[PDB]
Design goal:
Protein name: Beta-xylanase
Family: Belongs to the glycosyl hydrolase 10 (cellulase F) family.
GO molecular function: endo-1,4-beta-xylanase activity; polysaccharide binding
Number of strands: 10
Bound molecules: ligand G3I
Shape: globular
Order of helices and strands: HEHEHHEHHEHHEHEEHEHEHEH
Strand content: 15-25%
Structural class: alpha/beta
Keywords: Carbohydrate metabolism, Cellulose degradation, Glycosidase, Hydrolase, Polysaccharide degradation, Signal, Xylan degradation
CATH superfamily: Glycosidases
EC number: 3.2.1.8
CATH architecture: Alpha-Beta Barrel
Length: about 325
């Protein structure tokens, strides 16, 4: 293999990236997107703010651009995300009770219907749980609808799209801890009761030198509930600027994550949360952190690149 795409293809797995469709007009970004990945997810274009800016008025141009990119380049398309507490438009936050429930249901229905037969899998619900266990505490969905909203969302998604793989996605659930235990309980419950649910996403926004040693064990116990698993938003951030030591540790870390996936038969693959450090979300959220991706800000391959290739068995 001479590309990460070839390595993943050869392994029978997915290697994806988070796309900003506006960056496709930057030819270097498009060249790498085209050649190095066999799956794409919209970094932002399919979120609620991006798709339903006012009640029952939809703006699918950006999401369609991502879908068309996937179809044109023959990549799997992964859908992110139907229900998420973050970036929720004010019009939705202003609704309550049944009016809010109906807005959620309408959103799930219209977005899943719009992309039906193009999007292969959806993050139906994103970030429902709390670090330390139990439900997230700053969510409009949890606060207005309570525990049942997750099941409502999954059933609505299946009603709209009978075949798409329906996933729940979260972060800080890579190791076995109170948060991933809560997520595990729900997955087991849903499968026991026949609630539509096909997959679990592990975001894997990790810090350099801190990959959970129990990641494989955790992925495996989820797979054993009878669902697929996926590493959905991998990046491994360090204190900037990078140096040789940090880049080597980061490379080792990428290898650890991709190997954990390789070691679990139902792990569909790994998606990294962007292409280049140039555009990574990390520096804006974490002051003085960054350099989290496989390409640097000048689109040079970092040591992480060879580590990913090696881990896919290339
Ligand atoms: O936080 C990282 C992950 C965590 N898991 C779920 C996953 O969805 C999340 O992704 C991040 O999700 C965040 C919120 O939706 C995104 O951050 C938004 O990213 C947007 C686009 O970069 C930012 O706003 C943009 O600013 C630009 C100014 O040059 C404008 O061009 C855009 O129109 C404007 O929307 C928003 O302030 C910011 O809130 C990040 O790009 C995206 O990487």
């Amino acid at each position: 293999a001479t590309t990460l795409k070839e390595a993943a293809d050869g392994a029978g797995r997915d290697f994806g990236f988070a796309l900003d469709p506006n960056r496709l007009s930057e030819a270097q970004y498009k060249a790498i997107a085209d050649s190095e990945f066999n799956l794409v997810v919209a970094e932002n274009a399919m979120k609620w703010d991006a798709t339903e800016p006012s009640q029952n008025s939809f703006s699918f141009g950006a999401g369609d651009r991502v879908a068309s990119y996937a179809a044109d380049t023959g990549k799997e398309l992964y859908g992110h995300t139907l229900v998420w507490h973050s970036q929720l438009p004010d019009w939705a936050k202003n609704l309550n009770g049944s009016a809010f429930e109906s807005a959620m249901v309408n959103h799930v229905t219209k977005v899943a219907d719009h992309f039906e037969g193009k999007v292969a899998s959806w993050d139906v619900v994103n970030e429902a749980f709390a670090d330390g266990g139990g439900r997230r505490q700053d969510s409009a969905f949890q606060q207005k609808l309570g525990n049942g909203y997750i099941e409502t969302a999954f059933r609505a998604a299946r009603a709209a799209d009978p075949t798409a793989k329906l996933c729940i996605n979260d972060y800080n659930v890579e190791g076995i801890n109170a948060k991933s235990n809560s997520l595990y309980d729900l997955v087991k419950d849903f499968k026991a009761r026949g609630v539509p649910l096909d997959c679990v996403g592990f975001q894997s926004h990790l810090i350099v030198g801190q990959v959970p040693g129990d990641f494989r064990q955790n992925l495996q116990r989820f797979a054993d509930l009878g669902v697929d698993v996926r590493i959905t938003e991998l990046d491994i951030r360090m204190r900037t600027p990078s140096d040789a030591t940090k880049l080597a540790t980061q490379a080792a870390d990428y290898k650890k994550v991709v190997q954990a996936c390789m070691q679990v038969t139902r792990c569909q693959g790994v998606t990294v949360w962007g292409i280049t450090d140039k555009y990574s979300w990390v520096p804006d959220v974490f002051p003085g952190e960054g350099a989290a991706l496989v390409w640097d800000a000048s689109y040079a391959k970092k040591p992480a690149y060879a580590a990913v290739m090696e881990a896919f068995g290339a």
